[PDB]
Design a protein around this ligand. Sequence first.
Ligand SMILES: *C1O[C@H](CO)[C@@H](O)[C@H](O)[C@H]1NC(C)=O
Ligand SMILES: *C1O[C@H](CO)[C@@H](O)[C@H](O)[C@H]1NC(C)=O
Ligand SMILES: *[C@@H]1O[C@H](CO)[C@@H](O)[C@H](O)[C@H]1NC(C)=O
Ligand SMILES: *[C@@H]1O[C@H](CO)[C@@H](O)[C@H](O)[C@H]1NC(C)=O
Ligand SMILES: *[C@@H]1O[C@H](CO)[C@@H](O)[C@H](O)[C@H]1NC(C)=O
Ligand SMILES: *[C@@H]1O[C@H](CO)[C@@H](O)[C@H](O)[C@H]1NC(C)=O
Ligand SMILES: OC[C@H]1N/C(=N\O)[C@H](O)[C@@H](O)[C@@H]1O
Ligand SMILES: OC[C@H]1N/C(=N\O)[C@H](O)[C@@H](O)[C@@H]1O
Ligand SMILES: O=C1O[C@H]([C@@H](O)CO)C(O)=C1O
Ligand SMILES: O=C1O[C@H]([C@@H](O)CO)C(O)=C1O
Ligand SMILES: [Zn+2]
Lengths: 499, 499
Amino acid sequence: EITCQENLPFTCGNTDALNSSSFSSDFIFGVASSAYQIEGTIGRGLNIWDGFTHRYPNKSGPDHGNGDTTCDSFSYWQKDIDVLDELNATGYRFSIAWSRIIPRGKRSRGVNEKGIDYYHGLISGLIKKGITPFVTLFHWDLPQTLQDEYEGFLDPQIIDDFKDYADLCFEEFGDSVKYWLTINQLYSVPTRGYGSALDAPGRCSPTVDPSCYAGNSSTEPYIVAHHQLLAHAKVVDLYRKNYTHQGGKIGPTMITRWFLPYNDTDRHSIAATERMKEFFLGWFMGPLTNGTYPQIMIDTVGERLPSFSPEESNLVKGSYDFLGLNYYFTQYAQPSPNPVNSTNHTAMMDAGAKLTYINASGHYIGPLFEKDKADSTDNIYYYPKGIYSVMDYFKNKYYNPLIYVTENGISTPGDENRNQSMLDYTRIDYLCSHLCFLNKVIKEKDVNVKGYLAWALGDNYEFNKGFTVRFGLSYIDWNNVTDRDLKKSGQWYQSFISP
Amino acid sequence: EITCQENLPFTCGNTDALNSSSFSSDFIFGVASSAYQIEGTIGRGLNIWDGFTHRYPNKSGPDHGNGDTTCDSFSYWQKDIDVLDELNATGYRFSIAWSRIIPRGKRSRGVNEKGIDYYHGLISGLIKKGITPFVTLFHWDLPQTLQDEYEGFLDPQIIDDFKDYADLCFEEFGDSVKYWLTINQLYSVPTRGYGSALDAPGRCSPTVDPSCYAGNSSTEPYIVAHHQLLAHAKVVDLYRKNYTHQGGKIGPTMITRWFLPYNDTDRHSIAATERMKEFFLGWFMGPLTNGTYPQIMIDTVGERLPSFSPEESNLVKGSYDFLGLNYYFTQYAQPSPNPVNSTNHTAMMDAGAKLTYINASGHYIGPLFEKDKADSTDNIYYYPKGIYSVMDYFKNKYYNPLIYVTENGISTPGDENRNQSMLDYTRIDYLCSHLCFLNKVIKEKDVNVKGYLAWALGDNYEFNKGFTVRFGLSYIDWNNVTDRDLKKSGQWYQSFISP
Ligand SMILES: *C1O[C@H](CO)[C@@H](O)[C@H](O)[C@H]1NC(C)=O
Ligand SMILES: *C1O[C@H](CO)[C@@H](O)[C@H](O)[C@H]1NC(C)=O
Ligand SMILES: *[C@@H]1O[C@H](CO)[C@@H](O)[C@H](O)[C@H]1NC(C)=O
Ligand SMILES: *[C@@H]1O[C@H](CO)[C@@H](O)[C@H](O)[C@H]1NC(C)=O
Ligand SMILES: *[C@@H]1O[C@H](CO)[C@@H](O)[C@H](O)[C@H]1NC(C)=O
Ligand SMILES: *[C@@H]1O[C@H](CO)[C@@H](O)[C@H](O)[C@H]1NC(C)=O
Ligand SMILES: OC[C@H]1N/C(=N\O)[C@H](O)[C@@H](O)[C@@H]1O
Ligand SMILES: OC[C@H]1N/C(=N\O)[C@H](O)[C@@H](O)[C@@H]1O
Ligand SMILES: O=C1O[C@H]([C@@H](O)CO)C(O)=C1O
Ligand SMILES: O=C1O[C@H]([C@@H](O)CO)C(O)=C1O
Ligand SMILES: [Zn+2]
C-alpha cells in the first residue's frame, strides 16, 4: 500500500523511499522545453510570440523579457543534451519552431534547410545518448506571416498550412522521432490568446483590454479552439495514413487541472466543479473521444459554439494514439454569473464558475505554487493528489487512454540569487510529491501512464513572466548562458532516476 | 566670393563667418531621423528590420544591437520636439513606420488607429512649434508579412500594397504634412538588401554569403530597383491626382555621392568614374527624368535589366516635385572587371569600377569619416566639395530640380565615454564644411536647394552598426534614454540657425 503526502513537510525526496524502480521498468523519465522559450531568434523567422512580446512588452513579463536570446539553445543544444545525459534521462520533450523550418509559414514558399539541420543534429544527439524524443509540432510560436495573412488559428486556412508543416516534420524527422505532440495545451491559446489577451496573439474584446488590436473574447476562443481541433485531427490523420511505416505515435497535449468544490456540501459549488471539468477538459476531450462538444457547452454557448460536420466529427473522434497531459495544479470551484450580454463577456465566463485556491472554510489547498507580489490573494497553491485525481478521471471518463505526463514543475523567483536559486528544495518537494501520487494512481487505478517529463530542463523565458521566475532543474546565468548547472532538484532527479 | 575649406583644420564653426543668414530667408534648417532607428517595437507590428536583425544578429551590428527599444521615441516623441524647439529648427524629417499604422501590411486587413494617433500627435506638436515636417513613407521597414507573402519589393504585388499604404498616409496626415518622401535612398535596398545582404531582407547569391536564406545578387537588385521605381511613381501619381487639394509636394530620396577618377590622367579611370555616375545616380535618375535607364546600364546589364512599358515609362518620368538628396561622401573610381558568369557576381560589379578614398598618388580625399577597426584600409574619408559637385551635377544633368538635402552627418565611436561623446568637434567640422559648400553652390551655380536636414536629431540604432557608433546632434544615454542632450554640435547648430 502506497501512502503519499499532501502537505508540507514532504519526505519523498529520499530516494530510498521513492525512485524510478518504484515504477515499471519501461517507464520514461525526463524533462521538457519549448522552442520559443529556449532557442533564440537567430536562424529563424519571426513568430507571434516575437510579435506579441515586442508590440506589448509589458505583457511579455514584468521585466519586458522575451525569447530573443534566452538560453541560446540554438548555439548550446549540445549542453542541453549534456544535462539529459547527466540525468540519465530516457526522454526529452522539445518543440520544433515552425518559423525555424518554414520561416514564410506556408511550405510552398520554401523551407530553411539550415533549420532542418539544427533539429536533425539535436535528434541525432539525443538518440546517441539513449534519450527518446517527444516532439511538439506547435508550442504556440506561429509564424507571424500567418497571423497577419489570416489571423492564424482564427481562420480555417490554418488547417492546411499546419498540415503541410507537420508533413514536412514527419518526412524529415519521423524516421527517428516516434512520439509526436500536435498542439501544446489546447485550452491555452483560445482563452489566453483570444480571450484575456494575456498570450499571443493578444486579441480580445475592446473593454476586456483596450490594448488588444482586435478581437472578441466571447466568440473567438470557440472559433480558435474549433480550428485547433480540426488542424490537430487533420495532422493525426496525415500521420496515421501516410507515416504508419515510421512506427510512431501522435497525440495532442492537454493542460489538465483537477477541480474540487469550494464548498463540498453546497450543490451549487458541486455543480460548478462538474461544469469546470466539462468546460476545461471536456471542451477538447469530448471532441477527441466522441466527435462532439459536451452537452453543457452546447447548451450554454449556443450559437457561439461551432458545429462539426459529420466528416469533421469522424476526423476528430479518436484522433490520438496517446495523450500528453500537462499537470500543475488544482482549483476550487464556486458558482459565478455568466453575463453573455456584457461587452466584457469572455468565453471563460461560460463555465459559470469562479476559481480559487482557498475553500469556503478557509483551507488553502496545498503548498505555495506561485507567489503574486502585486496581489497576494492571487497566489497559486498546488495539490499533489490532483495528479492522481486527473489520471483516474482520464482513465474512467475518457476510455483508458495511453498517457505521458508531458509537463509538471514549479517556479522559484528570479529575485533569488544564484545560491538560493540552486538550493531549490521547494522544487524537489513539488516534483517528488507529484511523482509519489503518480506511482500510486498507476498502481491503484491501473492508469496507462508510461512516462513523465518535468518542466523544465533549464531556466528559460517563461511565457508572461520574462526571466522573473525560474523553472529549470538546471540553472542558467543570464549574464552568460552557456552553462546549465544541475540545481539541487536536478541532482535529486538524477538520484531518483538512477538510485 | 565664397571660399570654403576642404581640409583640416576648418574654421567654419565660427557663426560670425557662416550662419543661417548666409542662406536665403526661407531656407529650411533641421535634422532627420527614421522610424526603425528611433521608435521601438512597442505598439507596432514586425518589419523586415526586426526580422533581419533577429535572424542574423551579427549583421545587425557588432554589438548585436537592434531597434527593439532604441531611444524610445514612441514614448519620448515630445523630447524630440523639444530638441527641435531648442535648435529653433524649421524642419524635421522623420519616417512613418508602415508596421505601426498597418501592422498586417495590406490596408484591407485593417489599420492601427493608435498608430495613426501617434503620428497625428507628433505632427501636431511639430507644427505648433513652427517646424515643417518632411515625412518619409518608407525608410526600409517593410512589414514582415509582405516579405514573407511575396518577398516584398522583389514582387510586383508591392506596388498596390505600397500605394494603399501611401493613400492612408495622405488621407490621415496630408492636411498637415506638405513635404513627402517616398522611398529612402533608392539605391540601398536593391544593393545592400538583395545584393550584398548587408541590409534587410538579407537576400543574395549562395556564394556571396552562405547565410542568405535565398536570392541572386546578379538579378535581384535590378528587379527590386525596378519595382521601387514603379511603386514610387504610382504613389506620386496618386498624390498628384487625388491629393492636389493638400497643396504639398512629393519626391523620392536619393543617396548621392560624388565620384572622382582614382587617376585623373588615366582614361580608364575617367571612364570608370563616369560609369559610376550612371550606375549609382543614373540608375534611378534616368528613369525619373526620362523614363529609361542609362544606356550604359542597358548595354552592360542586358537581359538582367527590366524594361518599362510605354505606360510605365510615362508614369515614372517626371514623378517628383522635388528631390530629397542625402549626401555623405565621395569616392575615387578605377576600372574593375565585371565577371558576369561568376557565381559570386553581384549587380554592383556591373559598373566596372572599384571605389576607394585614396587616389593613385596616395592622396586621401579628405578628413576621416568612419574608422573601420577590423580593416583600416577600409576606413571612409569625406570630401566637403562633393556636396557642391553633386548639387551642380543635379542641376545640369537632371533638369534643374528643386532639392532638399534630406541627410548629411557623421558618426563618432560608441566606445567614447559621455564627455568625449558630447565634445563632438569632429561633427561641427563635418557639418559646417558641407554647409559652407552648399551655400557656395547655391550662390555660384544657382542650384535650387531650399533646405538642409542634418543626420541625426539624436543618437539612435544605426543600420548595420547597432549602438557602436553615434550620429546624433543630441546625446542619448543607453542606460536611460529619456533625455536628448545637445552635444557641442547641437549647440553650434543652434547658434548657426539663430546667430
Ligand atoms: C501597458 O501597455 C499597454 C500598451 O500596450 C497600455 O495600454 C497599458 O496601460 C500598460 N499597462 C500598465 C499597467 O501600465
Ligand atoms: C555570423 O552569422 C552567420 C549566421 O547568420 C554565420 O554564417 C557567420 O559565420 C557568422 N559570422 C562570423 C564572422 O562569425
Ligand atoms: C466587467 O468585468 C470586470 C471583470 O470581468 C468586472 O469587475 C466589472 O464589474 C464588469 N463590468 C460590467 C459592466 O459588468
Ligand atoms: C561564460 O561561461 C562559460 C562556461 O562556464 C565560460 O567557459 C566562459 O569563459 C564564460 N565567459 C565569460 C566572458 O565569462
Ligand atoms: C569571388 O569574389 C570575391 C570578392 O568578390 C573574390 O575575392 C574572389 O576572387 C571571387 N572568386 C572567383 C572564383 O572569382
Ligand atoms: C533617467 O533620466 C530621466 C531624465 O534625466 C530622469 O528624470 C530619471 O530619474 C532617470 N531615471 C533613473 C532611474 O535614473
Ligand atoms: O508555466 C510553466 C510552463 N507551463 C506550460 N503550461 O502549463 C507551458 O506549456 C510551458 O510553456 C510553461 O513554461
Ligand atoms: O549612416 C547614417 C545614416 N545614413 C542614411 N543613409 O546614408 C540612412 O538613410 C540613415 O538611415 C543612416 O542612419
Ligand atoms: O494549470 C495550468 O498550469 C499552467 C501554468 O500556469 C503553470 O505555471 C497553465 O499554462 C495552466 O493553464
Ligand atoms: O554614401 C553613402 O552614405 C551612406 C552612409 O554610409 C553614411 O554613413 C549610405 O547609406 C551610402 O550609400
Ligand atoms: Zn527583439
